[PDB]
Structure 1
């Protein structure tokens, strides 16, 4: 179990970030494994993967995902120039992250249709400090807690709607919670 930060563990990059609010425990396990337990958290994002990511990675994940409230399970990462926070959301709790967002299209990948959206974060935390930036979303219709994600299928679909990615920064399978509670235990490869 560790404090917020980034690093490398057992061959995998990890990032664990929170907004300073208590109630979250993040633990790195062997290999590509991590777990998170949270109770009345604030906002946090943690998981394992790669630094940098690539635009053609096939990401495998498996384990348990037991949110109680607002939470996401996603392939999650960033680019620079442009600065983009992106999500390929495989499962979520009580809140669909695209609520209120303008849909731009659909993509079929890895056994499901996904709906695609762009949103904007204004003056928020980011990998380069406080910033305004776009977010790109693919939201899986058929929720799951194990499988493989062909990231290129999403990135290509996004590109056809002008949702351009820059040079990749990190790319993880992330568990996110937003003022909620839950448990998750995920192995990445």
Structure 2
């Protein structure tokens, strides 16, 4: 069903929906691991389905339609504790590459494409544990797609070889993030 920002379990999958309060976004929990997002002249928002907690070797499958009309990303998104890390495995994006201004650490080949690895530090920003300072890890896919399989282990191993030491995995979802744009998406996670 269409819901206001929140988290929980729907049809077997953990979901998380958040928005800055700007308005213009509609999130709907669908059957199985499906969710739909329709936005128009939105603010910043993040919504998706997955697991709570996630694992370090989960192979995530996603399929559906992703039609951004501006700044938006489609990716495997999650958090880690001890160390506190916010991560993104970007599969597709709109008009803005989220790695812009980040520091490139290397590259990794996974699931039919090379990904560029980056890292950034967020100081005194909100997190799953409150206002904190943490690193943000990125894996940006060169060949964009809206359907496929993501072997998370390949990314975590690549990040580890670069100095990342993931600790306790918190939530892990396939999410659509929008940033003051418009668009629509219907993704099914499994």
How big is the shift at 1:101?
1.2
Q: Distance in 2 between matches of 1:165 and 1:40?
A: 36
Other structure's SS at 2:154 match: helix
Q: Please list the CA deviations of residues 94-150 of structure 1 after superposition, one character each: whole Å capped at 9, or x if unmatched.
A: 000001111000000000000000011222222122222111000000000000000
Q: State the distance in 2 between where 1:122 and 1:20 align.
A: 22
Unaligned runs of 5+ in 2: none
Q: Could you say what the CA RMSD is over the residues aligned between the two structures, in angstroms? A: 0.8
Within 2, Cα distance between the matches of 1:187 and 1:115? 25
Distance (whole Å) between structure 1 residues aligned to residue 102 and residue 164 of structure 2: 15
In 2, Cα distance between equivalents of 1:11 and 1:78: 20
Unaligned segments of structure 1, at least 5 residues: none
Rounded Cα–Cα distance in structure 1 between residues aligned with 2:132 and 2:28? 28
Question: Residue 88 in 1 paired to residue 109 in 2?
Answer: no
The count of residues paired between Structure 1 and Structure 2 equals 189
Question: Given the two structures, how large is their TM-score scaled by the length of structure 1?
Answer: 0.98
Which aligned segments of 4 or more residues in structure 1 are displaced greater than 6 angstroms?
Answer: none
- In the alignment, the residues of structure 2 paired with residue 136 and residue 161 of structure 1 have an alpha-carbon distance, to the nearest angstrom, of 11
3-state SS in 1 of match to 2:160: helix
TM-score with structure 2 setting the length:
0.97
2:57 aligns to what SS in structure 1? coil
CA distance in 1, matches of 2:133, 2:9: 28
The SS at the match of 2:3 is coil
